[PDB]
Amino acid sequence: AAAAAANLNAVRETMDVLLEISRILNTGLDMETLSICVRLCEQGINPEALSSVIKELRKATEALK
Amino acid sequence: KSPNVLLQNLCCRILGRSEADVAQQFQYAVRVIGSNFAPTVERDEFLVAEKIKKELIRQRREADAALFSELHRKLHSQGVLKNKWSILYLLLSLSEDPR
Amino acid sequence: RATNAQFDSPEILRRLDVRLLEVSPGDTGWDVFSLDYHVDGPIATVFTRECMSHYLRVFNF
């Protein structure tokens, strides 16, 4: 398939758009993890729950520093 | 991919641990994520975009405020994002001033 | 007060006042400073706001 891979290039293009959005906002997230988050909202999820998850997980790496 | 298993990849990305190493963080993740697996309303990415503009206003980047309307358009242009509201709410919730 | 500007009218020193640049993670005051002359009468019909912008750009240089 050829059109099914140009859509994957399209996914990477929006992923770089969200890369610029992540740096101007100063988030710690990288590209692989945001693709995991994209799949999470494919199944449907509260962003308020994902932010509480990540707002526990990042400042539970500051408790073993 | 299951709802349950994608959070262990979230745990393997933030922490340097596997799902077979830590189960205490992943437990609170399953507790919070599950039973709250439904978005609060249908999409309003425009309302969240006008608050991401308020973050770009806080830095006297008004040329990047004019870039944001063309960056917010590409999300709709490819259409691979189902909840454009959720990921913008998620980024906006983690907003810190570069400052 | 100490310099020659003291013997100039209090109105036009009053209309010129300080301003800054909204913040960024590499702030220096040499990066972040401006003066603002702002309109206090009908002079907006003479001085546009984008004219103050070009004013501030050549001021930055």
From Swiss-Prot, chain A:
Top-level taxon: Eukaryota
Keywords noted in UniProt: Acetylation, Cytoplasm, Cytoskeleton
Q: Which part of the full protein does this chain span, and how long is the full protein? A: 11 to 75 of 82
Whichever gene encodes this chain, its name is MZT1
List the subcellular locations: Cytoplasm, Cytoskeleton, Microtubule organizing center, Centrosome; Cytoplasm, Cytoskeleton, Spindle
Q: Which family does it belong to?
A: Belongs to the MOZART1 family.
A single Gene Ontology CC annotation of this entry is: interphase microtubule organizing center
Gene Ontology biological process terms from the UniProt entry: gamma-tubulin complex localization; microtubule nucleation by interphase microtubule organizing center; mitotic spindle assembly
Lineage of the source organism?
Answer: Eukaryota, Metazoa, Chordata, Craniata, Vertebrata
Q: How does it assemble?
A: Associates with the gamma-tubulin ring complex (gTuRC) consisting of TUBGCP2, TUBGCP3, TUBGCP4, TUBGCP5 and TUBGCP6 and gamma-tubulin TUBG1 or TUBG2; within the complex, interacts with TUBGCP3 and TUBGCP6 to form a luminal bridge with actin that stabilizes the initial structure during complex assembly. Interacts with TUBG1.
- The molecule here is called Mitotic-spindle organizing protein 1
**What job does this protein perform?**
Required for the recruitment and the assembly of the gamma-tubulin ring complex (gTuRC) at the centrosome. The gTuRC regulates the minus-end nucleation of alpha-beta tubulin heterodimers that grow into microtubule protafilaments, a critical step in centrosome duplication and spindle formation.
Organism per entry: Homo sapiens (Human)
UniProtKB/Swiss-Prot annotation, chain C:
Tissue and organ expression note? Ubiquitously expressed.
Q: Where in the cell is it found?
A: Cytoplasm, Cytoskeleton, Microtubule organizing center, Centrosome
Positions in coiled-coil regions: none
Function per UniProt: Component of the gamma-tubulin ring complex (gTuRC) which mediates microtubule nucleation. The gTuRC regulates the minus-end nucleation of alpha-beta tubulin heterodimers that grow into microtubule protafilaments, a critical step in centrosome duplication and spindle formation.
**What quaternary arrangement does the UniProt entry report?**
Component of the gamma-tubulin ring complex (gTuRC) consisting of TUBGCP2, TUBGCP3, TUBGCP4, TUBGCP5 and TUBGCP6 and gamma-tubulin TUBG1 or TUBG2. TUBGCP2, TUBGCP3, TUBGCP4, TUBGCP5 and TUBGCP6 assemble in a 5:5:2:1:1 stoichiometry; each is associated with a gamma-tubulin, thereby arranging 14 gamma-tubulins in a helical manner. Gamma-tubulin at the first position is blocked by TUBGCP3 at the last position, allowing 13 protafilaments to grow into a microtubule.
Q: What is stated as this protein's family in its record?
A: Belongs to the TUBGCP family.
What name appears for this protein in its UniProt entry? Gamma-tubulin complex component 3
Task: Tell me what organism the protein belongs to.
Answer: Homo sapiens (Human)
